[PDB]
Write an enzyme that holds these catalytic residues in place. Structure first.
Site, mmCIF file in Angstrom:
data_model
loop_
_atom_site.group_PDB
_atom_site.id
_atom_site.type_symbol
_atom_site.label_atom_id
_atom_site.label_comp_id
_atom_site.label_asym_id
_atom_site.label_seq_id
_atom_site.Cartn_x
_atom_site.Cartn_y
_atom_site.Cartn_z
ATOM 1 N N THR A 1 -24.340 -2.729 -7.985
ATOM 2 C CA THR A 1 -23.238 -3.678 -8.100
ATOM 3 C C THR A 1 -23.006 -4.401 -6.779
ATOM 4 O O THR A 1 -22.867 -5.629 -6.743
ATOM 5 C CB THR A 1 -21.959 -2.961 -8.547
ATOM 6 O OG1 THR A 1 -21.708 -1.842 -7.687
ATOM 7 C CG2 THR A 1 -22.078 -2.482 -9.988
ATOM 8 N N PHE B 1 -13.461 -5.918 -10.996
ATOM 9 C CA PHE B 1 -13.382 -4.497 -10.676
ATOM 10 C C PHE B 1 -12.614 -3.705 -11.729
ATOM 11 O O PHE B 1 -12.080 -2.633 -11.425
ATOM 12 C CB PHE B 1 -12.750 -4.295 -9.297
ATOM 13 C CG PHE B 1 -13.578 -4.834 -8.164
ATOM 14 C CD1 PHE B 1 -14.682 -4.135 -7.702
ATOM 15 C CD2 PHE B 1 -13.249 -6.035 -7.555
ATOM 16 C CE1 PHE B 1 -15.448 -4.627 -6.658
ATOM 17 C CE2 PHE B 1 -14.010 -6.532 -6.510
ATOM 18 C CZ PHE B 1 -15.110 -5.827 -6.061
ATOM 19 N N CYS C 1 -11.990 -0.132 -10.456
ATOM 20 C CA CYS C 1 -12.972 0.351 -9.492
ATOM 21 C C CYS C 1 -12.297 1.012 -8.295
ATOM 22 O O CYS C 1 -11.585 0.347 -7.527
ATOM 23 C CB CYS C 1 -13.849 -0.802 -8.995
ATOM 24 S SG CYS C 1 -14.843 -0.386 -7.535
HETATM 25 C C1 HEM Z 1 -19.310 -5.410 -6.051
HETATM 26 C C2 HEM Z 1 -19.362 -4.086 -6.244
HETATM 27 C C3 HEM Z 1 -18.686 -3.348 -7.430
HETATM 28 C C4 HEM Z 1 -18.275 -3.835 -8.617
HETATM 29 C C5 HEM Z 1 -18.370 -5.286 -9.151
HETATM 30 C C6 HEM Z 1 -17.704 -2.739 -9.376
HETATM 31 C C7 HEM Z 1 -17.172 -2.829 -10.647
HETATM 32 C C8 HEM Z 1 -16.511 -1.835 -11.339
HETATM 33 C C9 HEM Z 1 -15.867 -1.970 -12.630
HETATM 34 C C10 HEM Z 1 -15.805 -3.262 -13.474
HETATM 35 C C11 HEM Z 1 -15.336 -0.785 -12.959
HETATM 36 C C12 HEM Z 1 -14.561 -0.462 -14.254
HETATM 37 C C13 HEM Z 1 -15.569 0.077 -15.263
HETATM 38 C C14 HEM Z 1 -14.909 0.411 -16.575
HETATM 39 O O1 HEM Z 1 -13.696 0.118 -16.749
HETATM 40 O O2 HEM Z 1 -15.608 0.977 -17.455
HETATM 41 C C15 HEM Z 1 -15.625 0.150 -11.889
HETATM 42 C C16 HEM Z 1 -15.258 1.479 -11.834
HETATM 43 C C17 HEM Z 1 -15.645 2.378 -10.862
HETATM 44 N N1 HEM Z 1 -16.398 2.085 -9.741
HETATM 45 FE FE1 HEM Z 1 -16.993 0.233 -9.146
HETATM 46 N N2 HEM Z 1 -17.784 -1.596 -8.608
HETATM 47 C C18 HEM Z 1 -18.378 -1.929 -7.406
HETATM 48 C C19 HEM Z 1 -18.633 -1.057 -6.367
HETATM 49 C C20 HEM Z 1 -18.373 0.300 -6.371
HETATM 50 C C21 HEM Z 1 -18.576 1.220 -5.266
HETATM 51 C C22 HEM Z 1 -19.141 0.798 -3.888
HETATM 52 C C23 HEM Z 1 -18.203 2.449 -5.677
HETATM 53 C C24 HEM Z 1 -18.210 3.799 -4.913
HETATM 54 C C25 HEM Z 1 -18.273 3.918 -3.582
HETATM 55 C C26 HEM Z 1 -17.746 2.332 -7.050
HETATM 56 C C27 HEM Z 1 -17.276 3.366 -7.833
HETATM 57 C C28 HEM Z 1 -16.577 3.247 -9.018
HETATM 58 C C29 HEM Z 1 -15.897 4.315 -9.725
HETATM 59 C C30 HEM Z 1 -15.842 5.791 -9.272
HETATM 60 C C31 HEM Z 1 -15.339 3.796 -10.828
HETATM 61 C C32 HEM Z 1 -14.510 4.556 -11.886
HETATM 62 C C33 HEM Z 1 -13.078 4.720 -11.383
HETATM 63 C C34 HEM Z 1 -12.245 5.431 -12.416
HETATM 64 O O3 HEM Z 1 -12.393 5.115 -13.626
HETATM 65 O O4 HEM Z 1 -11.438 6.316 -12.032
HETATM 66 N N3 HEM Z 1 -17.864 1.012 -7.437
HETATM 67 N N4 HEM Z 1 -16.345 -0.528 -10.923
#
Ligand code: HEM
Ligand code: HEM
Lengths: 449, 453
Positions: A262, A387, A394
């Site tokens: 991502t 995000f 996120c």
């Molecule tokens: C440009 C970079 C990123 C984008 C566009 C992005 C996007 C997203 C999105 C859209 C979700 C929601 C997914 C859902 O609702 O099913 C999400 C959840 C999550 N992302 Fe990211 N992400 C990015 C970078 C990262 C990074 C760097 C990490 C960890 C260091 C990360 C860890 C997580 C985690 C753990 C969740 C779940 C949180 C929860 O539901 O409690 N992501 N991300």
């Protein structure tokens, strides 16, 4: 009242529409034809793809809708376990890890990760400084090298040393091959038996290494500035419990999965949009030179890269690299005054279509103009969701944006870029999005580190 | 190790610094110069003003620090008695009233107060609907009319009828003058002087006015046996699970006076500051007005609809960040302790939490601390622990927080639904200081959207 639906394939309903190598872009084209909402039916599955801010702002009402595991997330759960990204909101380990991990992903926590992020960013800068003349850069490949090593170092003090390698670290090979199997399952059986067996081998590779590093860290008693130390010492304030070792493994695998490609796609799309818009590139390069006055950027300097941040946000608008998320109705409800939904009915938020809603952004939705984000209160509610939403948003947002702002700022400070092939945008689709084959030349500004 | 201190006045030490009409804002300016902590000395008094999240998170450790009665609270205690806000934690009546009253201030309890809150909110909307063209609104004056009548109705089913009056109800006149005397006492260098003998007599007269009316209503309610949806009925019927005792009639009186004091102008200042910030930030107003129109689809808002006003809630929190209307609270060290690894404190040493400075800590909020951006609160998960304390801390936190926020959310949502607002004077923010904060002289014009109630 009556909901549009794309073409059907007899008993298979809409499912063959996903048997294409660019499914998100195909779903965007369907949204262009059918509008803000269309039904998608498959054997044993019904969902609805939302594309307008009008409906998505209601879908983001957490009192009415909760996060659903898409089929992609369900398949990812087979190796991400009950980590944060692949767990239900009602699972005990979600709220537990959420409470424990939230302080270590805050903007304040990025001050502690900054030194490690700079370590990898300098390696990227030095690689490009050491290229010979008329050699070129494979942008998504190098961005993935950077983001993978950054999350490894900040996550659990492990160096994948991706810039010393042609073939990635064995863990990365298994993780990438597991993610490919997850997506391929979406598009499918006796012939798939070797894929299924291979899937278990890659799961074992990931579990073994992560479990070993956790055990090694427990055996050493060393304290680092990484997420692994925070999880070994942290306690959920609510229940008073710490995460068990199995969940810590799933969280580490999750950070690598959810974070690496991502973020590397964001950097790749950002650089693509900059070299296609030389005036925007010049403006961003101006800010990088004015702000990054030291050989090594500081945390405070990265916060000062305001226009670079707008560039990243505009890149996320056009091509959000996590392009969808799923929701379900907690109770019977009516969406937008005309689409009744029963309890449990599923929704899909098509993020790239949401970000092209002309009622929000104007007619120039396809233009790359970071100035859209100059004032954040001018953006209507729930119009910009790269995000996710709410408590299931996120957790790594601040991590991803800090790394991407630092690295892009350093890239813009140290090099001028040439689109030497007049690259034609070709977006390869896995569970994420990236500009396949994007290449540039870099001419060094000869600024020392 | 060595603690900064502002300028001194010989034998009076720092005390004359408070003899100014904007003391909180003066203390903020001192905090800007001296940093996260400075000592404040007076004849017979020493305290330390905290401004950083770094130190305040330790002061909020209940194992090390307990609520202290500031000199302001001590003066309010002369008419608030051992009510919840002016009693020590170790006083029997605190935990007693705390246990009895907590269930009646929960978010679930707001369902029972909603109808009464709507009653007064409709009166405010109707007043503004009936204004003539190019007439204007005196914002804090009307917000105070609303919050006083709402707490009067929800507190003990009494209608002050402030919207039928120019001069407030005699109880309100005495209460405000009692609060004014409490603050003026803080700024007197020779308080025992003969000149303040008329102030002292008037102070006792106002105390008698407040007791007489509240005692009469308690006696009136006990003699009738009537049951309403107000706090007075809950206090007449409630029993502390711990001691098994109900509140006696005197303490119930002090609790009712306390709700009026602690609640009326803290909440009216929040609404006033919120509307000020909205008319100064038109993009935020449009975003909040959109939500109000989409969510409040009925002529009368429901409890569930008010909970859906998320962005309105974000607007209120950001208004509380910049100008918390109860701008400080006091703590004392339970035992000898070291604050922040460099400030040794002995048992009984006092601390003051300067809330508006805490909410401007750039290490938590970034450089744009002075900007009004409700989007800071879009995800409540982004706010670090003890960085945002408009309602106090711990078991001594504001018991009326849910009440204040429901009232404010409902009224602001109705205001945004029914009117467009004009800052017709380009009002220059002027914060008048009593024991609370308000934008003095803030005025707007309202043009009705012609939506019936
Ligand atoms: C440009 C970079 C990123 C984008 C566009 C992005 C996007 C997203 C999105 C859209 C979700 C929601 C997914 C859902 O609702 O099913 C999400 C959840 C999550 N992302 Fe990211 N992400 C990015 C970078 C990262 C990074 C760097 C990490 C960890 C260091 C990360 C860890 C997580 C985690 C753990 C969740 C779940 C949180 C929860 O539901 O409690 N992501 N991300
Ligand atoms: C925006 C509005 C309000 C703000 C900013 C506010 C702020 C505060 C603060 C900072 C404290 C702690 C004082 C200290 O520690 O010395 C407090 C306590 C208290 N407030 Fe509020 N308040 C508000 C509204 C209300 C309302 C509406 C009520 C009653 C209906 C109320 C009743 C109380 C009581 C009883 C206490 C003492 C609780 C205890 O110590 O057990 N307040 N408030």
């Amino acid at each position: 009242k009556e909901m549009p639906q794309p073409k059907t394939f007899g008993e298979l309903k809409n499912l063959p529409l996903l048997n294409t190598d660019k499914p998100v872009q195909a779903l965007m084209k369907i949204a262009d034809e059918l509008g803000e909402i269309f039904k998608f039916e498959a054997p044993g599955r019904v969902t609805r793809y939302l594309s307008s801010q009008r409906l998505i702002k209601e879908a983001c009402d957490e009192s009415r809708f909760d996060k659903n595991l898409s089929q992609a997330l369900k398949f990812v759960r087979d190796f991400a376990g009950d980590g944060l990204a692949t767990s239900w909101t009602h699972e005990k380990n979600w709220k537990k890890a959420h409470n424990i991990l939230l302080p270590s992903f805050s903007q304040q926590a990025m001050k502690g990760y900054h030194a490690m992020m700079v370590d990898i960013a300098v390696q990227l800068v030095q690689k490009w400084e050491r290229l010979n003349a008329d050699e070129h850069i494979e942008v998504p490949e190098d961005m993935t090298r950077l983001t993978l090593d950054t999350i490894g170092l900040c996550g659990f003090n492990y160096r994948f040393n991706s810039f010393y390698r042609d073939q990635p670290h064995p863990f990365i090979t298994s993780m990438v091959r597991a993610l490919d199997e997850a997506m391929n399952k979406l598009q499918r059986d006796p012939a798939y038996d070797e894929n299924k067996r291979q899937f278990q081998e890659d799961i074992k590779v990931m579990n073994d290494l992560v479990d070993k590093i956790i055990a090694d860290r427990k055996a050493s008693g060393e304290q680092s500035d990484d997420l692994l130390t925070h999880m070994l010492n942290g306690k959920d304030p609510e229940t008073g419990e710490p995460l068990d070792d199995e969940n810590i493994r799933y969280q580490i695998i999750t950070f690598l999965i959810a974070g690496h490609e991502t973020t590397s796609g964001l950097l790749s799309f950002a650089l693509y949009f900059l070299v296609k818009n030389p005036h925007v590139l010049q403006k961003a390069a101006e800010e990088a030179a004015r702000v990054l006055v030291d050989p090594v950027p500081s945390y405070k300097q990265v916060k000062q890269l305001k226009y670079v941040g707008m560039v990243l946000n505009e890149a996320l608008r056009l091509w959000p690299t996590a392009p969808a998320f799923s929701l379900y109705a907690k109770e019977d409800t009516v969406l937008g005054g005309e689409y009744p939904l029963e309890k449990g009915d599923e929704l899909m938020v098509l993020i790239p279509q949401l970000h092209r809603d002309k009622t929000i952004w104007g007619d120039d939705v396809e233009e790359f103009r970071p100035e859209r984000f100059e004032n954040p209160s001018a953006i209507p509610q729930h119009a910009f969701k790269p995000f996710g939403n709410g408590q299931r948003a996120c957790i790594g947002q601040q991590f991803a944006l800090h790394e991407a702002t630092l690295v892009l700022g350093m890239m813009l400070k140290h090099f001028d870029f040439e689109d030497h092939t007049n690259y034609e945008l070709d977006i390869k689709e896995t569970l994420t999005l990236k500009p396949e084959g994007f290449v540039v030349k870099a001419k060094s500004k000869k600024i020392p580190l």
